[PDB]
Amino acid sequence: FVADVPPPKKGTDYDFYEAWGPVFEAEARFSKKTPIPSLGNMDSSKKEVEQFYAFWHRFDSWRTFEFLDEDVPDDSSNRDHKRYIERKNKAARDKKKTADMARLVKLVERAVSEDPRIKMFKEEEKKEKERRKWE
């Protein structure tokens, strides 16, 4: 199957790439979209880093949450039974998918907040704006 890698433990010391690279690599195996950009390296360009986080901000997963599906009968004498349990199952899966999406949103937010390149990119932009003097 596809293995899961938890995020690095908040509040410990670690290299940003050593810690988060394996997390995104594992999460990305569930992508319905390719190509799949890499977290990258210390020298990735601002545009590459923007593209990486854009992919995640639009992530579309095929991860299934079908473990708690009720069995759907094909032979019920109640004609509505089959579609009813399909819809009840799907509602449960959808709730879990919604949670999974929310989980990923928070994971990505965390990574953005720790990305050392973004800190430098924001410093560079700040100096650009100051030079431009549009206020």
Q: How was this structure determined?
A: X-ray
Specify if 7 maps to a domain.
no
List, in order, residues 6 or more apart from 41 with CB less than 8 Å away.
17
Query: Among candidates 47, 25, 50, which has minimal Cα distance to 38?
Result: 25
Give domain status of residue 132, yes or no. Answer: no
Alpha helices in 14-60 (DSSP H): 16-28, 46-57
Residue 115, CA atoms < 13 Å, CB-side half-sphere = 24
Q: How many domains does the chain have?
A: 1
Q: For residue 61, give every residue at least 6 positions away whose Cβ sits within 8 Å of its Cβ, in sequence order, or none.
A: 30, 31, 32, 97, 100, 101, 104
Q: CA distances (Å), 51 to each of 13, 18, 76, in order? A: 27, 20, 51
Please give the DSSP secondary-structure letter assigned to residue 12: S
In a domain, 62, yes or no: yes
How far apart are alpha carbons 34 and 108 in whole angstroms? 18
Please give the residue range of the domain that contains residue 56: 16-127
The residues near 72 (Cβ < 8 Å, ≥ 6 apart) are: 82, 85, 86, 89
The CA-based angle 52-57-60, given to 5 degrees, is: 100
